[PDB]
Design an enzyme around this catalytic site. Structure first.
Site, PDB file in Angstrom:
ATOM      1  N   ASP A 179       0.823  -1.189   0.000  1.00  0.00           N
ATOM      2  CA  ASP A 179       0.000   0.000   0.000  1.00  0.00           C
ATOM      3  C   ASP A 179       0.864   1.248   0.000  1.00  0.00           C
ATOM      4  O   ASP A 179       1.848   1.344   0.751  1.00  0.00           O
ATOM      5  CB  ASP A 179      -0.825  -0.031   1.228  1.00  0.00           C
ATOM      6  CG  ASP A 179      -1.816   1.079   1.247  1.00  0.00           C
ATOM      7  OD1 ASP A 179      -2.660   1.039   0.381  1.00  0.00           O
ATOM      8  OD2 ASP A 179      -1.744   1.967   2.095  1.00  0.00           O
ATOM      9  N   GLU A 204       1.910  -0.395  -5.034  1.00  0.00           N
ATOM     10  CA  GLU A 204       0.944   0.552  -5.542  1.00  0.00           C
ATOM     11  C   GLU A 204       1.512   1.950  -5.600  1.00  0.00           C
ATOM     12  O   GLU A 204       1.478   2.685  -4.603  1.00  0.00           O
ATOM     13  CB  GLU A 204      -0.255   0.562  -4.663  1.00  0.00           C
ATOM     14  CG  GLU A 204      -1.291   1.537  -5.187  1.00  0.00           C
ATOM     15  CD  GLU A 204      -1.926   2.432  -4.152  1.00  0.00           C
ATOM     16  OE1 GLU A 204      -1.397   2.570  -3.066  1.00  0.00           O
ATOM     17  OE2 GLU A 204      -2.957   3.020  -4.442  1.00  0.00           O
ATOM     18  N   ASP A 289     -10.383   1.761  -5.059  1.00  0.00           N
ATOM     19  CA  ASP A 289     -10.271   3.191  -5.058  1.00  0.00           C
ATOM     20  C   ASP A 289     -10.813   3.808  -6.338  1.00  0.00           C
ATOM     21  O   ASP A 289     -11.679   4.694  -6.320  1.00  0.00           O
ATOM     22  CB  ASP A 289      -8.840   3.614  -4.953  1.00  0.00           C
ATOM     23  CG  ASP A 289      -8.100   3.307  -3.673  1.00  0.00           C
ATOM     24  OD1 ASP A 289      -8.717   3.190  -2.599  1.00  0.00           O
ATOM     25  OD2 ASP A 289      -6.871   3.217  -3.793  1.00  0.00           O
ATOM     26  N   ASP A 396     -18.107  -4.178 -27.678  1.00  0.00           N
ATOM     27  CA  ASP A 396     -17.428  -3.502 -28.777  1.00  0.00           C
ATOM     28  C   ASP A 396     -16.040  -4.055 -28.665  1.00  0.00           C
ATOM     29  O   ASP A 396     -15.026  -3.376 -28.417  1.00  0.00           O
ATOM     30  CB  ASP A 396     -17.352  -1.970 -28.638  1.00  0.00           C
ATOM     31  CG  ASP A 396     -18.541  -1.097 -29.061  1.00  0.00           C
ATOM     32  OD1 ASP A 396     -19.261  -1.440 -30.007  1.00  0.00           O
ATOM     33  OD2 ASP A 396     -18.721  -0.036 -28.447  1.00  0.00           O
TER      34      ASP A 396
HETATM   35  C1  LIG Z   1      -6.550   6.363  -2.476  1.00  0.00           C
HETATM   36  C2  LIG Z   1      -5.070   6.595  -2.720  1.00  0.00           C
HETATM   37  O1  LIG Z   1      -4.720   7.968  -2.990  1.00  0.00           O
HETATM   38  C3  LIG Z   1      -3.400   8.277  -3.510  1.00  0.00           C
HETATM   39  O2  LIG Z   1      -3.429   8.314  -4.943  1.00  0.00           O
HETATM   40  C4  LIG Z   1      -3.735   9.614  -5.492  1.00  0.00           C
HETATM   41  C5  LIG Z   1      -2.592   9.919  -6.438  1.00  0.00           C
HETATM   42  O3  LIG Z   1      -1.337  10.117  -5.761  1.00  0.00           O
HETATM   43  C6  LIG Z   1      -3.008  11.133  -7.221  1.00  0.00           C
HETATM   44  O4  LIG Z   1      -1.875  11.715  -7.832  1.00  0.00           O
HETATM   45  C7  LIG Z   1      -4.117  10.716  -8.191  1.00  0.00           C
HETATM   46  O5  LIG Z   1      -4.418  11.755  -9.114  1.00  0.00           O
HETATM   47  O6  LIG Z   1      -5.289  10.371  -7.419  1.00  0.00           O
HETATM   48  C8  LIG Z   1      -5.097   9.573  -6.225  1.00  0.00           C
HETATM   49  C9  LIG Z   1      -6.378   9.167  -5.515  1.00  0.00           C
HETATM   50  O7  LIG Z   1      -7.250  10.286  -5.612  1.00  0.00           O
HETATM   51  C10 LIG Z   1      -2.283   7.401  -2.965  1.00  0.00           C
HETATM   52  O8  LIG Z   1      -1.034   7.640  -3.606  1.00  0.00           O
HETATM   53  C11 LIG Z   1      -2.660   5.918  -3.132  1.00  0.00           C
HETATM   54  O9  LIG Z   1      -1.529   5.131  -2.754  1.00  0.00           O
HETATM   55  C12 LIG Z   1      -3.903   5.649  -2.248  1.00  0.00           C
HETATM   56  N1  LIG Z   1      -4.283   4.256  -2.296  1.00  0.00           N
HETATM   57  C13 LIG Z   1      -4.225   3.467  -1.076  1.00  0.00           C
HETATM   58  C14 LIG Z   1      -3.762   4.012   0.205  1.00  0.00           C
HETATM   59  C15 LIG Z   1      -4.674   4.279   1.224  1.00  0.00           C
HETATM   60  C16 LIG Z   1      -4.227   4.841   2.592  1.00  0.00           C
HETATM   61  O10 LIG Z   1      -3.397   3.988   3.384  1.00  0.00           O
HETATM   62  C17 LIG Z   1      -6.155   4.000   0.921  1.00  0.00           C
HETATM   63  O11 LIG Z   1      -7.203   4.488   1.756  1.00  0.00           O
HETATM   64  C18 LIG Z   1      -6.503   3.203  -0.385  1.00  0.00           C
HETATM   65  O12 LIG Z   1      -7.627   2.353  -0.161  1.00  0.00           O
HETATM   66  C19 LIG Z   1      -5.286   2.404  -0.865  1.00  0.00           C
HETATM   67  O13 LIG Z   1      -5.554   1.565  -1.990  1.00  0.00           O
END
Ligand SMILES: C=C1O[C@H](O[C@H]2[C@H](O)[C@@H](O)[C@H](O)O[C@@H]2CO)[C@H](O)[C@@H](O)[C@@H]1N[C@H]1C=C(C=O)C(=O)[C@H](O)[C@H]1O
Ligand SMILES: C=C1O[C@H](O[C@H]2[C@H](O)[C@@H](O)[C@H](O)O[C@@H]2CO)[C@H](O)[C@@H](O)[C@@H]1N[C@H]1C=C(C=O)C(=O)[C@H](O)[C@H]1O
Ligand SMILES: C[C@H]1O[C@@H](O)[C@H](O)[C@@H](O)[C@@H]1N[C@H]1C=C(CO)C(O)[C@H](O)[C@H]1O
Ligand SMILES: C[C@H]1O[C@@H](O)[C@H](O)[C@@H](O)[C@@H]1N[C@H]1C=C(CO)C(O)[C@H](O)[C@H]1O
Ligand SMILES: [Ca+2]
Ligand SMILES: [Ca+2]
Ligand SMILES: [Ca+2]
Ligand SMILES: [Ca+2]
Ligand SMILES: [Ca+2]
Ligand SMILES: [Ca+2]
Lengths: 403, 403
Positions: A179, A204, A289, A396
């Site tokens: 994560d 990720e 997400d 498609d």
């Molecule tokens: C939900 C996540 O957000 C972040 O991603 C963002 C990107 O950095 C941004 O540049 C892009 O435009 O949009 C994003 C989301 O709006 C984090 O970098 C990403 O790692 C994160 N995903 C996980 C981490 C969590 C917190 O510990 C969560 O709550 C998510 O469920 C995870 O999958």
């Protein structure tokens, strides 16, 4: 290797417990040809979905179920041939107890002993108010809402590697999805991967695409996939390490709405990470997400099958998302595609040749044996070779396979 | 070789006569770096614009002016270095006199003798009612509204080659543009080209583009340029023969409205004829049919300069259209481009390398010395090499040249 994401944002809410629920889908999953399922964060978390962990060894406070249920599920997956990979949220951790300052910066591993019972010193120098300034600075990005673990501290590295080996050994996990791996350096990640030795690990790394002067992503997203390809280099190209291919997901999202020319990059190769290092790239149409109830970057709904026709026939390692497979009714079309793929031995490093990528038609040939057409273009036959017969089709999309 | 089309659909209407009018623009034309100007049909025509010829030797009944004025204009062009090329409308001809049947099928060359005074036998076997069934069938397409000349008849071939050599010799024409060259076979055309020996000849082969399942042209228009490339083969690849590149015109028309990705073909090379045989291809943004008051296939008006930024920097031989140069006020931007082109010795066979072709940016480098950017994309500098300075720019175009 086709992965499945065995949960979504709502899963913690499930009546009677998600791991229990998931017991029932193991056969179906095994049957689709799925080789790994990514399970949600197992420990006690302040946030119900898991991404805000506290007592890392306390799997019993999970809202998904308790340690006993986890092991039964991982037992079942294993009994059916599939591996279980775990969401390792170790960038940040929430604290159990207030210290002297009244700040929640005393951690509790979940056991009567001291494993993982750190205090402010293991929080990255600068993450005020939690930090007490004495730890090392953060190796990567900060997560606002919680303490960031200082992964350069050696007690941190040892107890977190013990916890990783416990999850493998006592719980049964085969691999890791890291994560928010932007949270710490590829170097720190490398220690955890190397020393826990997973059979699979996917990081990720999610950053934005480059957007042009039109409000739409650029065709070239080389800065974006370079960053993925780079993490895999530092971590170790010979490892089990891969990154989710957010580049293909971002492009596809747009491409599918009548801009399929977006799928032949500047170099005539696939525009996502799979055009440079397909081997180390795992592809997806959506996850908890981007999709689910969070809707952060959803795939156009009336088009998710063109997304699976693409990721399932193409190089890279595909990841089917729970909802599509089980709740949208796409099960069978998805199955059929996973078959085409497995039948012809299409695999993470298959060769791709893009025949055409016009707004209304994307036609690619994988490994000489399968051709996939995405798009509403009707007049197509003239380009698909004699010798191929259609293997699957639906909205498609259509994929032919040779003889 | 940059050609100019010295007329448009309204030119015959001009107060005081178009050739006379055009006397005044010779210096300007010569100065822009124009090497050939294509003059409208010179003979007596039933239709005022010229494309319905009758007394081929009677240049005096032209609504553009009389033989004396033509020779003065061609004299002036020649005195200034430029060549004059003539619109040879020889697929069809209109008749002067009714025969016995009451059908207008007796031709009159325009002189007291018999040159060109044919009758129904020189009309293609099947073009009822004009034909009397005794001539050869048509070598090519039919023009509905008039008698089609049987170009396999030997008297036709001789008198029409005498008339061609007279236009070269007594009138001064240097080359030919063959109107409706779909009207007859490349073989017939070859006799006329070979035996009149022009210094330049361009055929007008105009067919439709392939349109996809979306109402828009396909990205691949290989059937369309194959047909141009083929006429040039049969006529003779070593000849002076070229065809107008309707493929680039058709594509560009669309590409310019935010679909500049259309400019990198299936093979990563230019999508029009200039991607296969640039040498034998003459490019244009519009002509008296596509544009002018006929509007058959107009270039988007607010974008004609992106069209000239493309044709003027790219391989193929460019053709500037009267109106753009003289009536739209683009004179100076067009000049500047013709200079960039001439200065760097860019020429019909220059090498083209397409750097990027995204919806909002087309960036190409010609001959290593010039880069042209089309499109509204702002963030561009990162892709144009160190060593180049901008040579011209205007609305959604800019061209850099090296040092
Ligand atoms: C939900 C996540 O957000 C972040 O991603 C963002 C990107 O950095 C941004 O540049 C892009 O435009 O949009 C994003 C989301 O709006 C984090 O970098 C990403 O790692 C994160 N995903 C996980 C981490 C969590 C917190 O510990 C969560 O709550 C998510 O469920 C995870 O999958
Ligand atoms: C005006 C012209 O029409 C024809 O072109 C048509 C194409 O064949 C068609 O497929 C395309 O979609 O649209 C076209 C126009 O609508 C002829 O092929 C073309 O040669 C012709 N152009 C000249 C011939 C004439 C008759 O002698 C004219 O009146 C024009 O002024 C000529 O330039
Ligand atoms: C094939 C590649 O295209 C290059 O232009 C990228 O800049 C590069 O990062 C990427 N390279 C990666 C891909 C592979 C495999 O194809 C490797 O082994 C490299 O180390 C790894 O960096
Ligand atoms: C380069 C070419 O691409 C091919 O796929 C076309 O089918 C062909 O017609 C075209 N060929 C032409 C172009 C050139 C010059 O490049 C020639 O000399 C050929 O005779 C002429 O047919
Ligand atoms: Ca403890
Ligand atoms: Ca923090
Ligand atoms: Ca961090
Ligand atoms: Ca006569
Ligand atoms: Ca006719
Ligand atoms: Ca004809």
């Amino acid at each position: 290797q086709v992965l499945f994401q065995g949960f979504n944002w709502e899963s913690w809410k499930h009546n009677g417990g998600w791991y229990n629920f998931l017991m029932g889908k193991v056969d179906d999953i095994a049957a689709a040809g799925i080789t790994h399922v990514w399970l949600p964060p197992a420990s006690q978390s302040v946030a119900e979905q898991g991404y805000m962990p506290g007592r890392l060894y306390d799997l019993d406070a999970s809202k998904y179920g308790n340690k006993a249920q986890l092991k039964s599920l991982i037992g079942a997956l294993h009994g059916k041939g599939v591996k279980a990979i775990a969401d390792i949220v170790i960038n940040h951790r929430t604290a159990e107890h207030k210290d002297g300052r009244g700040i929640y910066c005393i951690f509790e591993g979940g056991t009567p002993d001291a494993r993982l019972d750190w205090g402010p010193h293991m929080i990255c120098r600068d993450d005020r108010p939690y930090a007490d300034g004495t730890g090392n600075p953060d190796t990567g990005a900060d997560f606002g809402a919680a303490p960031d673990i200082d992964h350069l501290n050696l007690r941190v590295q040892k107890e977190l590697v013990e916890w990783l080996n416990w999850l493998k050994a006592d719980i049964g996990f085969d691999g890791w999805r890291f994560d928010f791996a932007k949270g710490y350096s590829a170097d720190v990640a490398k220690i955890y991967i190397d020393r826990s030795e997973p059979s699979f690990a996917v990081a990720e790394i999610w950053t934005s695409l480059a957007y042009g002067g039109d409000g739409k992503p650029n065709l070239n997203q080389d800065q974006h996939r370079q960053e993925l390809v780079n993490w895999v280099d530092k971590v170790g190209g010979k490892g089990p390490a891969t990154t989710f291919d957010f580049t293909t997901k971002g492009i596809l999202n747009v491409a599918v709405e009548g801009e399929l020319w977006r799928l032949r990059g500047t170099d005539g190769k696939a525009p996502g990470m799979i055009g440079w290092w397909p081997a180390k790239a795992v592809t997806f149409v959506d996850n908890h997400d981007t999709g689910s109830t969070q809707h952060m970057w959803p795939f156009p709904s009336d088009r998710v099958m063109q997304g699976y026709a693409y990721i399932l026939t193409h190089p890279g390692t595909p990841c089917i998302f729970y909802d599509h497979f089980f709740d949208w009714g796409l099960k069978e079309e998805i199955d059929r595609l996973v078959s085409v793929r497995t039948r012809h031995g299409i695999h993470n490093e298959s060769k791709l040749q893009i025949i055409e990528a016009d707004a209304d038609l994307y036609l690619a040939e994988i490994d000489g044996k399968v051709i996939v057409k995405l798009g509403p273009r009707y007049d197509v036959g003239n380009l698909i070779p004699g010798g191929f017969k259609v293997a699957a089709h639906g909205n498609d999309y259509a994929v032919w396979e040779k003889i």
